[PDB]
Design a binder for this molecule. Structure first.
Ligand SMILES: CC(=O)N[C@@H]1[C@@H](O)[C@H](O[C@@H]2O[C@H](CO)[C@@H](O[C@@H]3O[C@H](CO)[C@@H](O[C@@H]4O[C@H](CO)[C@@H](O[C@@H]5O[C@H](CO)[C@@H](O[C@@H]6O[C@H](CO)[C@@H](O[C@@H]7O[C@H](CO)[C@@H](O)[C@H](O)[C@H]7NC(C)=O)[C@H](O)[C@H]6NC(C)=O)[C@H](O)[C@H]5NC(C)=O)[C@H](O)[C@H]4NC(C)=O)[C@H](O)[C@H]3NC(C)=O)[C@H](O)[C@H]2NC(C)=O)[C@@H](CO)O[C@H]1O
Length: 540
């Protein structure tokens, strides 16, 4: 007779292809990429003949087989593809094979293949749009927003984006390499811990706890291998297979390393580390470079060189070459983007007409034109146009686009920036004709998280009532609120100014819109980005 039916032994059923060491703070130790997951299964036979061959089946296919030599056994084998498998043990002899009931096993991988889709309800004022315009609709999500701001990946209105950018992935380096981090409490230290035993100029993760280990919706079980932002973004990729999720390298405080990359030894180490990072974290779809900025005038007053232009173009060509190689190794399309200053003085430090040939999209940072960093020369921080009172205003969106176009950049490469925050001042005074932007200020407005900056959610929720004036400047295409008694003045984008930008994009055949930062919106901004670019209301 055929063998008795085996009983699969109770035991761990969760395994990983990319292992995460749960007691490691250094990135080098934290993640271990294997070719295949080591799986184990054991069984007992409570009734009958044990057969002469035991096999482990996944979905009916043999993953292991050996002699059946007693009433219990164990099998250790490798599984090289992520997913959920119905595993059975079968005992066979010449008279037949008898299979156990199936037990699911979970084989983890960083494409999110082991994960349920994370497909969460729209919150706040967000309404559903179809991505059918062909235009970019992007936004940044910040790794540290999961603490105070309490804004997690399950809160992103992901159906309403084409591009989700993760700020920010750091470049390893201590003294003289990331000095701009020292201005943020404990930040520089944290990077040194992550980067322990790791070369400088290779990428790492800045907060491995937030990125990989914090409990979050859908990844809360102790043995879920990937938690935090990365585990949720993997599950988001399962829900939104066409969303481009890009790691963004740099930003205001993590850009110092780029200034060293005129040394091709360092640039090549960087590029190679980016390749390794995308082979490790397969849910990411390319890389965004946010170097602030070639030529200097970024956070560090001691960096910047006339060579930075050339280094930027070389870097993009070499990133593109590495992504094209990754793309054909994998069958995937990988994207290369960059967030750039919109100031013409910074634009013309780079030959974007040359670098565009390597880049899918240019994220024009058409915001921060004005703010509490300059208490004397006030103006709209994210306007499309100059205002009536100063038609020669240098920093406007249109001027940054036109600088790019005047170099020879193709319009379709250019994605226009919209602000999900305001900047502002207090104590504004000495202004004429009821236009507060003609005065000067005494300090920063009281921000939501930091001085001088206010989430749009808070502008809409608190500063559109009581004593606050609200004015839409139709020349500049820009809203502002002003509290006369405290001279508090805030310049921000609203649904109407966003709709202007979006019509301007369609009229000038630009690439789309993107925003900073997704946590600060209540829905009104991203709704308008979508509507204004022609995306159909509704759900695919
Ligand atoms: C025309 C012209 O040329 N004009 C120029 C202006 O351009 C120029 O001003 C600059 O303009 C550029 C653009 O041209 C801006 O850059 C781009 O866009 C954004 C701006 O529009 C930039 O955004 C900024 O991004 C930086 C990131 O580098 C943000 O810094 C982050 O700040 C927060 C505080 O708010 C820090 O938050 C803390 O994070 C830690 C994590 O380690 C958390 O710690 C956790 O705490 C919990 C307890 O609650 C604890 O339990 C956990 O254990 C603990 N975690 C750990 C790991 O231990 C804290 O909780 C957390 N606190 C908060 C509040 O959340 C965060 O760490 C810090 N990040 C880093 C990595 O440093 C900054 O806030 C962003 N600003 C805005 C606008 O929001 C972006 O960099 C860049 N990219 C893109 C695509 O946008 C520049 O911002 C701008 N600079 C200035 C100075 O404004 C001016 C020059 O002044 O000049 C004109 O001429």
């Amino acid at each position: 007779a055929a063998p008795g039916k085996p009983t699969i032994a109770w035991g761990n059923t969760k395994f990983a292809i990319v292992e995460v060491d749960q007691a490691a703070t250094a990135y080098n130790n934290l993640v271990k990429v294997k070719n295949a997951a080591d799986v184990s299964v054991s069984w007992n036979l409570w009734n009958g003949d044990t057969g002469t061959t035991a096999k482990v089946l996944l979905n009916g296919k043999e993953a292991w087989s050996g002699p059946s030599t007693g009433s219990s056994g164990t099998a250790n084998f490798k599984v090289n593809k992520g997913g959920r498998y119905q595993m059975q043990v079968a005992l066979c002899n010449a008279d037949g094979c008898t299979a156990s009931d199936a037990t699911e096993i979970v084989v983890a991988d960083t494409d999110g293949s082991h994960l349920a889709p994370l497909k969460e309800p729209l919150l706040e004022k967000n309404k559903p749009y179809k991505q059918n315009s062909g235009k970019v609709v992007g936004s940044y999500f910040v790794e540290w927003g999961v603490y105070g701001r309490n804004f997690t990946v399950d809160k992103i209105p992901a159906q309403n984006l084409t591009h989700l950018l993760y700020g920010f992935i750091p470049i390893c380096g201590g003294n003289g390499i990331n000095d701009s981090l020292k201005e943020i409490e404990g930040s520089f230290q944290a990077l040194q811990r992550s980067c322990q035993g790791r070369e400088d100029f290779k990428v790492s993760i800045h907060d491995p706890f937030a990125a990989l280990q914090k409990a979050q919706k859908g990844v809360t079980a102790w043995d879920d291998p990937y938690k935090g932002n990365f585990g949720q973004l993997m599950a988001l990729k399962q829900a939104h297979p066409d969303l481009k999720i890009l790691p963004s390298i740099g930003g205001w405080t993590l850009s110092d390393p780029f200034f060293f990359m005129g040394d091709k030894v360092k640039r090549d180490r960087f590029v190679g580390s980016v390749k390794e990072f995308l082979q490790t974290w397969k849910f990411f779809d390319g890389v965004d470079i946010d170097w602030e900025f070639p030529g200097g005038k970024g956070a560090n007053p001691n960096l910047g060189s006339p060579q930075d232009g050339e280094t930027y173009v070389l870097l993009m060509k070499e990133l593109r070459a590495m992504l094209d190689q990754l793309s054909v190794e994998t069958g995937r399309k990988y994207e290369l983007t960059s967030a750039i200053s919109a100031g013409k003085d910074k634009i013309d430090k780079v030959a974007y007409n040359v670098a565009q040939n390597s880049m899918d999209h240019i994220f024009l940072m058409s915001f921060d034109f004005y703010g509490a960093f300059d208490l004397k020369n006030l103006g709209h921080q994210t306007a499309l146009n100059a205002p009536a009172w100063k038609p020669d205003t240098a920093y406007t969106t249109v001027n940054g686009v036109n600088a790019l176009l005047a170099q020879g950049v193709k319009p379709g490469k250019i994605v226009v920036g919209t602000a999900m925050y305001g900047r502002g001042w207090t104590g504004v005074n000495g202004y004429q004709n009821n236009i507060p932007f003609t005065g000067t200020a005494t300090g920063p407005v009281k921000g939501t998280w930091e001085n001088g900056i206010v989430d749009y959610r808070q502008i809409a929720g608190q500063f559109m009532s009581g004593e606050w004036q609200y004015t839409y400047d139709a020349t500049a295409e820009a809203p502002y609120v002003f509290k006369p008694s405290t001279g508090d003045l805030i310049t921000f984008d609203d649904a109407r100014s966003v709709q202007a930008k979006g019509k301007y994009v369609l009229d000038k055949q630009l690439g789309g819109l993107f925003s900073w930062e997704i946590d600060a919106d209540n829905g009104d901004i991203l709704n308008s980005m979508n509507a204004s670019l022609g995306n159909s209301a509704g759900v695919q």
